[PDB]
Amino acid sequence: STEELFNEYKLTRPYMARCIRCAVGSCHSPIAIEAVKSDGHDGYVRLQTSSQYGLDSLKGRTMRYDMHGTIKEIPLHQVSLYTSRPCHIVDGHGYFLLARCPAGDSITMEFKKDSVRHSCSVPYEVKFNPVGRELYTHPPEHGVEQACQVYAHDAQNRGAYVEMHLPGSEVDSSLVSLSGSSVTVTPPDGTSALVECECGGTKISETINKTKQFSQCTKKEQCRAYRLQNDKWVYNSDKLPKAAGATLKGKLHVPFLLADGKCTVPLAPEPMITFGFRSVSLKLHPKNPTYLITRQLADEPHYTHELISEPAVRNFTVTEKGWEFVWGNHPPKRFWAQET
Amino acid sequence: ELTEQGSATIHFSTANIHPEFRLQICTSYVTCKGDCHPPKDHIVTHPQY
Amino acid sequence: EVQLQASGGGLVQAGGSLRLSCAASGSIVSINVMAWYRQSPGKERELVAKSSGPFTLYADSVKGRFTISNDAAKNTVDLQMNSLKPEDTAVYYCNAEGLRYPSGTYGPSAVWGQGTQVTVSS
Amino acid sequence: YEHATTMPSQAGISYNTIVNRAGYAPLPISITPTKIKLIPTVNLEYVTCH
DSSP, X not given: OOHHHHGGGGGBOOOOEEESOOSSSSEEESOOEEEEEOOOTTSEEEEEESSEESOOOOOSSEEEEEETTEEEEEEGGGOXXXXXXXXXXXXXXXXXXXXXXXXXXXXXXEEEOSSOEEEEEEOOOBOOOOSTTBOOSSOOSSOEEEEEEEEOSSOOOOSOEEEEEOBXXXXXXXXXXXXXXXXXXXXXXTOEEXXXXXXXXXXXXXXXXXXEEETTOOSSTTOEEOOBOSSSBEEOOTTSOBOSSOOOOOEEEXXXXXXXXXXXXOOOOOOEEEEETTEEEEEBOOSSOEEEEEEESSSSOOOEEEXXXXXXXOEEEOOSSOEEEEETTSOOEEEOOOOO | OOOSSOOOOOOOOOSXXXXXXXXXXXXXXXXEEOOXXXXXXXXXXXXXO | OOEEEEEEOEEEETTOOOEEEEEEESSOSBOOEEEEEEEOTTSXXXXXXXXXXXXXXXXXXXXXXXXXEEETTTXXXXXXXXXXXXXXXXXXXXXXXXXXXXXXOOXXXXXXXXXXXXXXXX | OOOOOOOOSOSSOOXXXXXXXXXXXXXXXXXXXXXXXXXXXXXXXXXXXX
């Protein structure tokens, strides 16, 4: 069962935000990216978005987002995002997205409506971490198994929680309009609004679905009308004003927490050894940059660590006490000389 | 500002560990003498005076 | 010297629900890592569960069927099992790592209990 | 500024020190130890009874 997991985010709504770079410029968008985390080894990254996923206006793959206070929905396979190459969206749940695509320097996320394209790009570093000691850029078809950390594919109630807050007052210039001589305020049906003005003196009025006109005001730009909502909490976003008083009403769990799993890691080619009197030579040919670590079995190791990305030649000396080395991810190889 | 029988407080700076000088006040000379000590700050953000 | 005592388990039919309990006793005040490990015959040891304070972890083949709860006050970890499969036949061990002795002579880091055998019949 | 001081190992008595500066006023220090513990590092071997 998963509806009990989804129940937490039925209590919230999407929210408009500011994003520095839409397709035009400094902009207000529904897809503002708050933060990005890239700690998993296989390129799995977590995006914290301003929209909601998996909830209809319960459906599998959809994006639920906000338009000047009006909630709208789109199929999930329309939105895209990229850093340097086209990324791939896996799944979404609430304010979080799990993505799998290679390294880069900026995150761009975009989608296309019937005629208007929405997008923006944020410059937060995304890093690709190789496992083991064989640097690569795309995981291999075959190799061996290791234990690294990858981000879990499914949602569950973990010990990590976030905080919501009571929403603030949202100014909307659309509500206010000019009558013949007064200012007309038309709050939306089934919701309350707050009108504050200084056209004459200080004014404050809570209207509840009432079309009221105020005297002494001629132009409309003098003053403002807001929107009030009690339910449908919002995340502790830094891009919003806060409400009045203690701003705390619970917390929600964060899915897609990291976990331990089995990892495919490449295997380097076998180095060809040639032996001589108290010495060894390693004919060597790497497919990718790889680490040599070499040690002696005496009181002092003379440990040597080296990164090689080209064919090369190395001649090592070995004594009776012993020599040991690791190339790539092979088990360590120990050689022990003999009198001759 | 000089009063009838008050005491005048004056701020100054010097470069001597053992300051000793003659101060001119408007008709006369007086002798001032003392022993200064290092300040605390190693690097400051104002000019030498 | 701290020791871990395991209890629970036993014989059951396919689809049953059991409980495993591991308790720590000795010169200990606060514990960090509660974990469970399973070892089937002819195979190496593997992790099944991992609990540490509020956080809990699960392996790939065991999600949605095992639940882990830790009580730091009693320093016990309880593993609730539901809807068991014939692949679950193994001996289960409980692990404790990051032990904080209350001075509390500093000693071995990790300890191990005897464990319990769990067998489900098809 | 570094200042070294010595403390007798005995609780129940006070101890006063003055930190002297050539160009600044002396600074007082008052110290009173309340309780000192000498905890041994002990391991457990076995237990016996009737």
